Structure formats: structure tokens, C-alpha cells
């Protein structure tokens, strides 16, 4: 028979040189990391405006006004290095020492952005 945003002090903004910092994540959930301007919203999407340039590995996408598939995803217990060069306006991301690649075969993530008043590290 409801994401949380974290950043540094606005006075620590940079306008020249090469600046690099690390972001470790023991998990692989919703996490974005990048560089914002000292006017970015603490409640808006990290990067969805002209005030931040980020990267989200949960979908392997660089984050700007829109999303573009960039790099690869991470896993539990990984690190990512952010580098920003202001003399040439270039941002780069390295997942565990491996430089991320875009679809056009270029290691560069963002290019040709105005310095404005500075770039501060930011995570979400």
C-alpha cells in the first residue's frame, strides 16, 4: 500500500601614495570590504553610491553604482588585502596573496576616480 558598517576616522583620509590593509573573515557570509569617501552613509548599501568603492566575495563582485562580476569567492577563515594607489588611481584586491582578476583579464579593479577629499578603509 540590517548590515553593520565600520570605518576609520574621517581625519585619517589619504590623498597620495600607496595604502594597503588586511581584512580577515572567519566566515564566508555577507561581507564587503573596500575604500569609501568620508561622506558615505552608515545605512546605505556599501558602494551603491558615488561615495564608496568596495568588493563582496559572497557573490564575487566589485561594488560601485552597480555590480560587476570581479574576482572569486572566499571561504571560512580567509584574508583579503586591499591596496589603493592615489598617484595612478588604481585599486587592487588580493585574496590570500592571490591577486584578483576581472573579466577583461586585468588585475585592476577601479580606475580613473577623483581624489575628492580622501579615501578611508571601510567594511560591511
Q: Give the integer Cα–Cα distance in Å for 13 and 76.
A: 31
The set of residues, in sequence order, having a beta carbon less than 8 Å from that of 101 and lying 6+ positions away, is 71, 107
Give me 52's grid cell. Answer: 564608496
Experimental technique of record: cryo-EM
Q: Give the integer Cα–Cα distance in Å for 63 and 6.
A: 16
Q: Give the integer Cα–Cα distance in Å for 24 and 79.
A: 4
Give the Cα-Cα-Cα angle 8, 71, 17 (nearest 5 degrees): 40
The 10 Å Cβ neighbour count of residue 99 is: 14
Amino acid at each position: 500500500y540590517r548590515f553593520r558598517i565600520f570605518r576609520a576616522e574621517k581625519t585619517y583620509a589619504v590623498k597620495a601614495g600607496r595604502w594597503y590593509f588586511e581584512f580577515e573573515a572567519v566566515t564566508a557570509g555577507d561581507m564587503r570590504v573596500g575604500w569609501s569617501r568620508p561622506g558615505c552613509q552608515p545605512d546605505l548599501e556599501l558602494g551603491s553610491d558615488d561615495r564608496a568603492f568596495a568588493f563582496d566575495g559572497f557573490k564575487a563582485q566589485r561594488w560601485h553604482q552597480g555590480n560587476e562580476h570581479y574576482g572569486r569567492s572566499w571561504q571560512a577563515g580567509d584574508v583579503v588585502g586591499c591596496m589603493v594607489d592615489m598617484n595612478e588611481h588604481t585599486m587592487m584586491f588580493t585574496l590570500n596573496g592571490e591577486i584578483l582578476l576581472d573579466d577583461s583579464g586585468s588585475e585592476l579593479a577601479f580606475k580613473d576616480f577623483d581624489v575628492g577629499d580622501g579615501f578611508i578603509p571601510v567594511c560591511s
